[model samples]
Target: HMCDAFVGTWKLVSSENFDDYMKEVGVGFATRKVAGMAKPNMIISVNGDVITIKSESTFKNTEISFILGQEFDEVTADDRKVKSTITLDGGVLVHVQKWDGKSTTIKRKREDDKLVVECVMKGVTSTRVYERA
Candidate 1:
């Protein structure tokens, strides 16, 4: 089942241009420094149509709740405040968030040994790969 692939905890393994990516979202230098050092934990819980992803770290914590095939409001972990919606694009979970009247889309998937999460903002994009813990 698609939900089965996401029902566990995962940790940030590595990211491409993560520091700059965080900076793009208005994360301060000190917080970004700590964020780079401290591993973030992501837990996904699925109950029928309801799904929740909680990202936790020593420096920050964020929880997002949504139902499958539905749109909801969300505030990103970074300071970019936004209204958001989540949906499935093929097998990948997709999120579109609007901030400052601008929209960003994030696509997430789990395949083989990697959990891939990608974000696109304006014309810039970043991907973060993680491993199950």
Candidate 2:
């Protein structure tokens, strides 16, 4: 099943274009600077309809919860609060976050030994791929 692919807690090992992705989400200069230097942690837990992702860093910690195929309110790590929806497309998890008069979608999946997260916002897109720790 699709849920089986996401059963474990995964840490962030490395990322690409993460700084740009944060900037697109309106993260401030100081926070973004710190974020660029700090390594963030991500843990995902799936249980039936509820899926939770915990994103933690030295400077901040944030958790997001949502039902599969359902829309719920969310506040992202960058502090962009929104009404969001998370769904599965094939084996990939997709999040549509609506906030600040705009909407963005982020898609995540696991391939081989890595977790790939792709973010699309305001005509710009980036991907951050992380390896298991």
Candidate 3:
């Protein structure tokens, strides 16, 4: 499965332009401050047709699980309940979330030994780099 490439433990190495992305997505100032200071580890696994992504951080933890191409309800780390869908496109895991008529997309790809996440909301785009652990 294409998901196999992403199955592993990844530790956050760095993030770029994430504060603006959070601001555009309606995250509060307090949480935004915390978000900028914390580094999270992403644990990905597969069981049958379901793929699970667990994010662990000192500030807060968030997780989601679903089969590829299926939509599920997700409560984001910032505490918004949104509809989310994850699909594999050309070796990238594309995750999309929609709420209050707004939306965001995150693309996770295995680049070399790193898992690179590109987050997009409106015109804002942020990049998060993670290394295998």
Candidate 4:
């Protein structure tokens, strides 16, 4: 039911330390500036074994598509090529992205009526909370 629970649009409520995490992961100043300021609503959809997440904002939009438990080549919003995978664990959706032997982990879980995404990269962690839209 974890995957079923995430099949809806979610609007950005607040993001904490995302700018710092992006900076730690080599995001440039200008991009990070706008990235931090823009509160994009997330569009999440599921089709059979595949899941897609789209972050749409006035600044830019990025989407990632992946099949559960399968590794896929994906380009991040910052234009980095990564090997990405997603797995359902308990009540959470766990995502891992790797590049150049380094990695970033993202955990998505439901909290009451909201969704919480915790992103960890380069020893820095950022928490982004979203509400069902």
Best by TM-score: 3
Q: For residue 121, what is the lDDT in candidate 1? A: 64
- Provide TM-scores for the models: 0.86, 0.88, 0.98, 0.93
Q: Stretches of candidate 2 above 4 Å error?
A: none
lDDT of 2 by residue, 28-131 (tens): 99878887776767787877667888877786888887787777878666677798888888889988988878888899998997788888877667777666
- Model 2 residue 131 CA deviation (Å) reads 2.3
Model 3: residues with Cα > 4 Å off, grouped in runs:
none
Q: Worst lDDT window (10 residues) for model 4?
A: 1-10
The ten-residue window of minimal lDDT in model 2 covers: 1-10
The superposed Cα distance between candidate 3 and the true structure at residue 37, in angstroms, equals 0.7
> Tens digit of lDDT per residue, candidate 3, span 71-132?
99999989999999999988999999999999999999999999999999989999999999
CA error at residue 76 for candidate 2, angstroms: 1.6
In the predicted model 1, the residue pairs found to clash are none
Residue ranges of candidate 1 with Cα displaced over 4 Å: none
Residue by residue across 31-125, what tens digits does model 1's lDDT show? 78887776788898887788899999886899999986666777666656778788876788888887776777888898798888887765667
- Encode model 4's per-residue lDDT on 12-64: one tens digit a residue: 99989998899888889998988888888888998877789999997788898
lDDT of 4: 0.88
